Design a protein around this ligand. Sequence first.
Ligand SMILES: c1coc(CNc2ncnc3sc4c(c23)CCCC4)c1
Ligand SMILES: *[C@@H]1O[C@H](CO)[C@@H](O)[C@H](O)[C@H]1NC(C)=O
Length: 333
Amino acid sequence: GNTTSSVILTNYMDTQYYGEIGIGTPPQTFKVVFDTGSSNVWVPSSKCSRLYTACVYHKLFDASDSSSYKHNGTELTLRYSTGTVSGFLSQDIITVGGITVTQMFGEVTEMPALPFMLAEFDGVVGMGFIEQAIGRVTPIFDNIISQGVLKEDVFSFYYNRDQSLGGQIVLGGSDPQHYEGNFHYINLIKTGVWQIQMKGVSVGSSTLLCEDGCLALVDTGASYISGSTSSIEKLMEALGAKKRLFDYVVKCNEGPTLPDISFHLGGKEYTLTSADYVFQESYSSKKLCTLAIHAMDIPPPTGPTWALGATFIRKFYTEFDRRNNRIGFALAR
Ligand SMILES: c1coc(CNc2ncnc3sc4c(c23)CCCC4)c1
Ligand SMILES: *[C@@H]1O[C@H](CO)[C@@H](O)[C@H](O)[C@H]1NC(C)=O
């Protein structure tokens, strides 16, 4: 119990954060989202048809090039908020920074253009619990915990804004170069999902939303802070933001006039300024600027729930603690 492993992350557009893993012997490299909202590992397969355009423009795992590959073949479908993939289970050695682990993962053969033609990453490394794993496949972090190499049973996420480091995941600890001060932690409501109680969402000093408490999924594979359609409607109305065709917008010049939004988590107020939630692509009075807050109706049993995604994580460096089933936050830098 003396190792940490860091993976540097690419930040694409403040909406996708991904880093690399190896799969096989020798390692084949894939860009992957490290996603606390799910618990399966998958990458696209060389058995993916090239009529799926996503399988032309992403890297494919070729199992016949790996001496450590072991066949399974059980088919599985993974249904995300933004899209669905299906494929078959395989087993091989996965390299994550300085760590290797024998892992069962999906070889995805069905990869629809929506959303995977807008995914700059190849696949997904689920950082959630086995309870949310499709097929009850042991998640990669649980298998890494079994090795007893990690200094602590935690992992941490730094997501940068906007060259610079796009971000960083640390397995086994945290990186104090990327946060100020000390963590305050919020306990999970229950084991099996990275979800915590939230005791209020305030706009300025007035708690408009989640007044009787609500749920917050801390979701490293989500781009935005999200709430239900109803919640976000009220939030946007409070801000003066309007729904342009697909998204909520403000006049770019008016972004700096917008009030702070605070999330009441574990007896602390986690406050984002308008600079933290308005995509200020301009400050022009002649242009419209979108917000990094979207409606997302997450179905039961996980939802209805808020999701604290990359927008939140940018502001607050986040440690996911499996030893204690809690989530730590500190101010990112
Ligand atoms: C990191 C932070 O935000 C993101 C945003 N994530 C995505 N963006 C666009 N398409 C997809 S498909 C898919 C995901 C995703 C997340 C992982 C499960 C499956 C990554
Ligand atoms: C594939 O893995 C699953 C565990 O999720 C197991 O039930 C099944 O027996 C495995 N198949 C083979 C051929 O080992």
